[PDB]
Amino acid sequence: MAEALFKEIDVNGDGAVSYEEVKAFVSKKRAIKNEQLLQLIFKSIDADGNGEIDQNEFAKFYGSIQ
């Protein structure tokens, strides 16, 4: 219900979540192996898609307020 979830999932306190981090987030709710969805969603959720999505990018992406 906020952006804190993005940083919360980042146990490494890096403020960035890569494709793996994303797939893991949803994996915590169930078991759904999506190679295509992961790749597409990875670049989609990532503003710059630079290996991982930064906290700032996620915030601005939340709600598609770009």
Rule CB under 5 A: which residues touch Ca ion?
10, 12, 14, 17, 48, 50, 52-54
| Shortest distance (Å) from residue 46 CB to Ca ion | 5
Annotated binding-site residue? 35: no
Contact 24, 13 (CB under 8 A): no
Contact 22, 39 (CB under 8 A): no
State which residue, 34 or 51, has the beta carbon closest to Ca ion.
Answer: 51
Annotated binding-site residue? 14: yes
Annotated binding-site residue? 4: no
